[PDB]
Design an enzyme around this catalytic site. Sequence first.
Site, mmCIF file in Angstrom:
data_model
loop_
_atom_site.group_PDB
_atom_site.id
_atom_site.type_symbol
_atom_site.label_atom_id
_atom_site.label_comp_id
_atom_site.label_asym_id
_atom_site.label_seq_id
_atom_site.Cartn_x
_atom_site.Cartn_y
_atom_site.Cartn_z
ATOM 1 N N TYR A 175 0.912 -1.311 -0.007
ATOM 2 C CA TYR A 175 -0.022 -0.067 0.046
ATOM 3 C C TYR A 175 0.896 1.260 -0.021
ATOM 4 O O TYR A 175 1.128 1.787 -1.046
ATOM 5 C CB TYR A 175 -0.935 -0.237 1.131
ATOM 6 C CG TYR A 175 -1.965 1.099 1.652
ATOM 7 C CD1 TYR A 175 -1.621 2.350 0.899
ATOM 8 C CD2 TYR A 175 -2.745 1.002 2.382
ATOM 9 C CE1 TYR A 175 -2.623 3.437 1.194
ATOM 10 C CE2 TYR A 175 -3.635 2.162 2.778
ATOM 11 C CZ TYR A 175 -3.811 3.321 1.984
ATOM 12 O OH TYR A 175 -4.650 4.192 2.201
ATOM 13 N N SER A 220 -4.327 0.159 -6.329
ATOM 14 C CA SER A 220 -4.418 1.571 -5.915
ATOM 15 C C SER A 220 -2.858 2.541 -5.845
ATOM 16 O O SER A 220 -1.931 2.597 -6.730
ATOM 17 C CB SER A 220 -5.275 2.126 -4.761
ATOM 18 O OG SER A 220 -6.233 1.185 -4.852
ATOM 19 N N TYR A 221 -2.838 3.192 -4.445
ATOM 20 C CA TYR A 221 -1.439 3.744 -4.207
ATOM 21 C C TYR A 221 -0.404 2.515 -4.092
ATOM 22 O O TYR A 221 0.653 2.875 -4.703
ATOM 23 C CB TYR A 221 -1.632 4.218 -2.685
ATOM 24 C CG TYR A 221 -0.404 5.242 -2.535
ATOM 25 C CD1 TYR A 221 -0.783 6.731 -2.768
ATOM 26 C CD2 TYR A 221 1.023 4.978 -2.331
ATOM 27 C CE1 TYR A 221 0.295 7.589 -2.613
ATOM 28 C CE2 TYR A 221 1.908 5.745 -2.185
ATOM 29 C CZ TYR A 221 1.700 7.181 -2.330
ATOM 30 O OH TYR A 221 2.649 8.198 -2.141
ATOM 31 N N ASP A 224 -13.669 2.565 -14.027
ATOM 32 C CA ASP A 224 -13.038 3.076 -12.700
ATOM 33 C C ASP A 224 -13.283 4.572 -12.664
ATOM 34 O O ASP A 224 -12.849 5.172 -13.199
ATOM 35 C CB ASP A 224 -11.587 2.592 -12.617
ATOM 36 C CG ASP A 224 -10.883 2.836 -11.301
ATOM 37 O OD1 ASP A 224 -9.885 2.038 -10.908
ATOM 38 O OD2 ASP A 224 -11.516 3.593 -10.614
ATOM 39 N N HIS A 274 -13.116 0.501 -9.486
ATOM 40 C CA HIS A 274 -11.880 0.242 -8.816
ATOM 41 C C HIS A 274 -11.709 -0.787 -7.851
ATOM 42 O O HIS A 274 -10.753 -1.286 -7.602
ATOM 43 C CB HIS A 274 -11.498 1.670 -7.797
ATOM 44 C CG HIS A 274 -10.405 1.894 -7.346
ATOM 45 N ND1 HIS A 274 -9.201 2.027 -8.245
ATOM 46 C CD2 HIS A 274 -9.863 2.157 -6.111
ATOM 47 C CE1 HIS A 274 -8.143 2.306 -7.505
ATOM 48 N NE2 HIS A 274 -8.489 2.049 -5.996
#
Lengths: 728, 723
Positions: free
Chosen positions: B504, B587-588, B665, B697
Amino acid sequence: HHHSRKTYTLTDYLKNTYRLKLYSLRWISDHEYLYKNILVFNAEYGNSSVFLENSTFDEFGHSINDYSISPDGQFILLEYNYVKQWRHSYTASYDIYDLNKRQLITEERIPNNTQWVTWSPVGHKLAYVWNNDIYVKIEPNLPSYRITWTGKEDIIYNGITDWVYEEEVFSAYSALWWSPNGTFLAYAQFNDTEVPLIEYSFYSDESLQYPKTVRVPYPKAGAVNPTVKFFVVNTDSLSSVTNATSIQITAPASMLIGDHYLCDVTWATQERISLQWLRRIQNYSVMDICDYDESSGRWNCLVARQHIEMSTTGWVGRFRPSEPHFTLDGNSFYKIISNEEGYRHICYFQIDKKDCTFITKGTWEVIGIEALTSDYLYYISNEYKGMPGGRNLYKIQLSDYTKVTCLSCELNPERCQYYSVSFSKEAKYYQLRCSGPGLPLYTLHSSVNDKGLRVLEDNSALDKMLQNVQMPSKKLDFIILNETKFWYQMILPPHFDKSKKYPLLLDVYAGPCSQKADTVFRLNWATYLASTENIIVASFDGRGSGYQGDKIMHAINRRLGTFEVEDQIEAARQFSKMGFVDNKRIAIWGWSYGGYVTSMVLGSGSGVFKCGIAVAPVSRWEYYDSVYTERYMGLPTPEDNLDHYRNSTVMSRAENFKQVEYLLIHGTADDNVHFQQSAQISKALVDVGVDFQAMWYTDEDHGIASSTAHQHIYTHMSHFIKQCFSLP
Amino acid sequence: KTYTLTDYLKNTYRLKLYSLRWISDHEYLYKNILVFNAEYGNSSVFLENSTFDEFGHSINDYSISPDGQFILLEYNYVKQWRHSYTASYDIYDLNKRQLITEERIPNNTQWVTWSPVGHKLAYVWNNDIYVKIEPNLPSYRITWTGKEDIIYNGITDWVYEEEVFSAYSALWWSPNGTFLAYAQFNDTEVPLIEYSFYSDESLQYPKTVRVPYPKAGAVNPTVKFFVVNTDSLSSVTNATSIQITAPASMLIGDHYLCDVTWATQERISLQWLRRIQNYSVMDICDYDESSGRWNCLVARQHIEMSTTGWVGRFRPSEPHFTLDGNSFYKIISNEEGYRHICYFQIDKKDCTFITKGTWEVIGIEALTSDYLYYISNEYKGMPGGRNLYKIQLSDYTKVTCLSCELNPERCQYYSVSFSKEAKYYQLRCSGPGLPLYTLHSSVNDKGLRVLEDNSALDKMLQNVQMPSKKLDFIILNETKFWYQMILPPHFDKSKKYPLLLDVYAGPCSQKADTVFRLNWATYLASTENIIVASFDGRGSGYQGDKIMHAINRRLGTFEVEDQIEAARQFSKMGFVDNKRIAIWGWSYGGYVTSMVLGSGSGVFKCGIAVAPVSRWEYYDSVYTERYMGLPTPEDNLDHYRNSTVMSRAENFKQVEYLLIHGTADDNVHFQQSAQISKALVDVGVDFQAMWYTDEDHGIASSTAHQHIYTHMSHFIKQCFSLP
Ligand SMILES: Cn1c(=O)c2c(nc(N3CCC[C@@H](N)C3)n2Cc2ccccc2C#N)n(C)c1=O
Ligand SMILES: Cn1c(=O)c2c(nc(N3CCC[C@@H](N)C3)n2Cc2ccccc2C#N)n(C)c1=O
Ligand SMILES: *[C@@H]1O[C@H](CO)[C@@H](O[C@@H]2O[C@H](CO)[C@@H](O)[C@H](O)[C@H]2NC(C)=O)[C@H](O)[C@H]1NC(C)=O
Ligand SMILES: *[C@@H]1O[C@H](CO)[C@@H](O[C@@H]2O[C@H](CO)[C@@H](O)[C@H](O)[C@H]2NC(C)=O)[C@H](O)[C@H]1NC(C)=O
Ligand SMILES: *[C@@H]1O[C@H](CO)[C@@H](O[C@@H]2O[C@H](CO)[C@@H](O)[C@H](O)[C@H]2NC(C)=O)[C@H](O)[C@H]1NC(C)=O
Ligand SMILES: *[C@@H]1O[C@H](CO)[C@@H](O)[C@H](O)[C@H]1NC(C)=O
Ligand SMILES: *[C@@H]1O[C@H](CO)[C@@H](O)[C@H](O)[C@H]1NC(C)=O
Ligand SMILES: *[C@@H]1O[C@H](CO)[C@@H](O)[C@H](O)[C@H]1NC(C)=O
Ligand SMILES: *[C@@H]1O[C@H](CO)[C@@H](O)[C@H](O)[C@H]1NC(C)=O
Ligand SMILES: *[C@@H]1O[C@H](CO)[C@@H](O)[C@H](O)[C@H]1NC(C)=O
Ligand SMILES: *[C@@H]1O[C@H](CO)[C@@H](O)[C@H](O)[C@H]1NC(C)=O
Ligand SMILES: *[C@@H]1O[C@H](CO)[C@@H](O)[C@H](O)[C@H]1NC(C)=O
Ligand SMILES: *[C@@H]1O[C@H](CO)[C@@H](O)[C@H](O)[C@H]1NC(C)=O
């Protein structure tokens, strides 16, 4: 040694190590042609004076994409700021350079963002389309005359085609047609008001913060089509005092009764133009022949001269009704139609007569009529040796149809079996291009004695380079199925051994009137796979394929996704039963229609194929454009053909994909076969739990033709095939 | 036998929860719907399992009114974004045992809420607010300005929902339902994200979805705040909403409303944040009797700022007011940079800290007359543990850990749910052992009973070769950094295992903790014998601002470098095959995985990025600007340009890459992977891709979830040479 140890590698293909030389020319008169820098080569004796030096436009300030010399040779149009649109369409800036005065015209310049420009066939009149409207310049340095005032972006097109007419009807952006001497300018007007828009994301340079939505009027099968109107304007009676007056020629009553297309425009004489119209149900077309009336200043099409072409077995023409070739007096014409036995031949028509007479016969087809003079008609056909994949030039005496002479057959029968031709302004000279099976060969000929004047390009430099390379060979042959010959070609690895078992890649198009088995020489991806990887790449022309008659071609009428699919599978069974194919390693791949067939085959449950690659495939016919799709499928309505539209999707076959390895590839900015189509395949495969390999190409279109994208996809496909075949 | 991919995908081994909703100070609801007592554990049925057999619709969720007289039934549920959705609603009279059919709540209702007491009802329909005093009577229209995609009354727009309130609703009833406070968002000039939606195979032409979405540095939505008196609503005149304007220190430029909290019946607190998120202000606003207006004294403003970073963890913390509303407690970072509970007086600038130490308060849970209850990671100096504490309000030195010792071996991560007046509480232990749910009396802090022990699951797991978790730290530059490892069964120190780094690494992230999970990592470790590691480096949370603010204005630097260094340290541990190290994240995590693979460190063989950010100008304004500032020449444009995945394209020649993204997304736009793929094609790098048609997403469709995890498993197994 000195034995060939080299092969034709992927890098060779991608970096163009081995380059095919061309000889492209342009006939300026009946004995003169231009070639590139710009020389007017005299065809007769070989003496060639220089026309335009390469240094002339160095101080120009822009990169020149293309040039166009006026018919009289007094001016040159310079095309720059080229921005590509669809397959044929584009936008550009243009400058005009006075050849006799040696300088650029600065007054009344052709505007930026011009959609199309064209000289008249004689002199130096100019027609151009800008912001969807037609403009005419009588002299390059004078103000232009605005012909149309109704041009509207994405709605009204004057002198240029919309998406569907460009791609599927005219294979061109222009919809402007000059009369033989430039007196009249005929044009089509398209109306897209109620045509639905395809919308997609365009991402652009990484500096674009918010993606763009591209919107294009695009009729999908069954949807509202564009309408068309046709006009003729006399350019000689243009005034700068009043607006120009365009004379409409209306479609015949039998066409106005429903949806229809304009599918051909051909000038016959200075004052006679022929039009071909086609019904949306493409089994019925009408040719109008219209004369100019001098007292009126109007155009009149006599119902007596009206000609009808239709089909009971399929659609009319190969992809559209064929074009007429009129005699000088415009009282007769020659045109390719299908005969009683289903074969396409040249029929000779009188203008005032319903019945024509056939001038060619046989179990072969005429590809095209190339030239006609007072004494001879020149045409290309596949007659020679009964090879439908071959092409030769023929000459028929107009006063005696038994007097047919092959002009190209025996010139060099071992290296040359596929010819195209380029005749001078009045067929006194012609250039022949041989595309295979040997290295391309370009030669010049005079038609009087049909003697060869000179070799233009013989590709000796490439022959020198290949001398040391382990190149593949090609086997072109047929198989008998249900008492009918079906042709296939095999790209065979060097040192081919019938006792060995090779992996096989079936390379497929298989769309209506396709031909993938021919005598053409090619340096491509298949060359690498055979030469370097030792894979046989094969192709098969089954039912639906062209140039062999309507019995074969019309077999898939209203039945897309059936026989042509079934014949590719059978082909693979035939190849393996030849004895040199490892049938644990049989693969299939295709682009476009070939993508569709590859997917239908992989979803068939045949068990013959281990893997396959679909690139930009059609997934279901309701997604594709009306003109192409309805030609073969009719309308997706209950009273027409909806049941088969629904029975021939890739999606419904998703479950069967558990048996094969699948690579699915599509460019995100594909305006032709929408990304939507692959998006729906993937979603269906995901819904049934089938694992597959995918690849999108950001901002690529149907050709995935960018230098970098082209290299990426072939490298990616190569890895996939090598792993499917367990090649190190 | 082992824990398999199918086990994960089909949730063969289920974790039981124990979900309750408090009704009073000693009564709660549990699912039949029973009204369990916090005294005796008995329960009389409130609604029978088949009461709505003859309803005709599939009921998605229920909601009883605070007085218990009416139940609200929700159906026709259509999801929108993370929290937003649309639904149909019916109200059932519990006394009359029949559905109300007069003046019904319209179809496509965006949000519904009861008042805190009684049976009043507020709802949002077509971006406007409506109020029902009685369920069967006509509603009063509060706002007339609602407009699709433009004006939002009582509901949030895209960015506020996702990044500010973590909720669709923007309605706030006063403690006794007299007042209904609400926010109004204006998206008029906020640019639109557009993307294709392909829908069912039957859709001939794709749909273009268009959403107001402010990317970094774009025009943001504007916000207004109102309060309306629900006790004096008239069906003759239009309702009058009193505006409360943002303070003068906020009106000077772009700003956000970040918190709404009622103090008493006639006192409301609002927090505001500048677009440059290192400065926030709390307003305390009182209802004025003789005027009917709300006044917020400038002397009652409380400033919260930061010199080293942004304010709050993700936003300024919420206040917890004393019953008279003259004092409150809230979490702020102290002088040493650690987040602790500060005690404020309404009329004074200076607060006094009631907690201290090199650890952090996670949240204030309940406030009574004699005790403040809170959760922290103090126990054993473990930032990844969670325990409940009681602080004596008359003596801050008297602090009792209520959960630390209940079961120290199986329980180290607690959350809590207190009763209405905090007389009882449910404890929720999430690890390191199987989750445990217990009930307690807060009068003596004695344990009443076990609610759920997960023994059913325990007996199931007895027959499976399960992985273990190592939670520990490494020292870097004289600072502790925590990591966790999911270790294969029968783990042997002498053998060299392949390793997967699970990432993450976003600001305030924490991936090394004491939580028990059954996930993809569980299968990889159990069946494939892959070590799955996570590392909390610079930028990570719950360890003070020195670590968290380390990446301020510098996204894609230290947090990236620290994942690489962590893997270097795992290599020196002796049981790791240095030829088989991989990295993945969503994501990140996708951003950092991609940044690491493009670093050319040579540490990683391969990786997977799922829905990654590729460059910060593509992501929303609230999240991005919090850490990055503005992408302008006068602010931080240079680092925005320096921190892209695209600029590292050439280094991907050294690695095997899988890039995955859903086409619909709305959060991290498909655009982001489209630009990555293009950059890799432009430098001639081969890689693997997968788009997911119409997935967002989450890539959370049953089929797509199974598909992505299957696809990734094959990729990882192929990378690691696993048959
Ligand atoms: C494999 N394959 C094709 O399928 C193909 C093709 N040239 C054409 N055209 C035929 C009519 C005129 C113009 N549309 C170009 N098609 C037809 C087609 C069918 C379905 C979807 C897309 C397309 C296309 N472009 N070629 C060269 C080819 O290899
Ligand atoms: C790997 N990873 C995350 O990156 C992540 C996350 N929860 C969040 N949120 C924090 C703020 C509130 C809300 N937006 C959710 N992020 C932040 C993020 C950064 C960049 C791009 C997308 C996202 C997202 N959603 N989780 C759970 C996670 O695993
Ligand atoms: C293009 O076609 C559209 C219809 O397809 C034409 O619009 C119609 O025009 C008439 C006359 O102005 C109107 O009264 C109708 O209401 C319109 N019909 C529809 C369905 O919109 C339009 O005139 C055409 N444009 C040109 C220049 O040919
Ligand atoms: C939402 O904000 C918009 C944009 O600032 C406001 O629209 C402006 O309103 C004024 C007064 O009516 C006009 O003079 C401007 O021309 C408008 N600008 C635009 C771009 O529309 C709008 O008033 C706001 N709406 C609400 C309910 O507050
Ligand atoms: C309450 O306010 C609303 C909105 O301002 C009023 O509704 C509008 O009334 C005006 C005239 O005052 C009309 O021109 C608009 O068309 C109305 N908009 C609609 C359809 O809501 C409403 O009348 C007000 N109620 C009263 C009577 O005070
Ligand atoms: C080419 O040859 C002709 C005839 O032999 C000669 O007179 C002339 O110079 C050349 N043609 C021109 C005009 O360039
Ligand atoms: C085309 O654009 C350039 C400026 O971008 C300008 O110099 C030129 O005059 C334009 N040409 C015409 C004919 O409009
Ligand atoms: C030509 O037509 C256009 C539009 O119909 C009109 O506005 C223009 O003035 C006309 N030109 C003249 C002067 O006849
Ligand atoms: C071109 O053809 C038109 C129409 O037949 C005729 O009137 C005109 O004179 C011709 N132009 C020339 C220069 O021959
Ligand atoms: C629990 O049982 C007692 C009787 O022992 C009863 O009075 C009470 O109402 C019950 N509680 C609930 C809410 O079921
Ligand atoms: C909700 O929609 C359904 C179906 O269109 C309709 O029958 C019903 O009356 C609606 N309910 C309300 C409260 O308007
Ligand atoms: C709720 O609070 C308001 C404002 O203080 C007050 O007028 C009202 O009496 C309260 N409601 C009741 C009846 O408890
Ligand atoms: C907020 O951030 C900006 C940019 O880093 C800085 O100039 C300013 O001093 C900060 N304000 C505070 C309260 O530290």
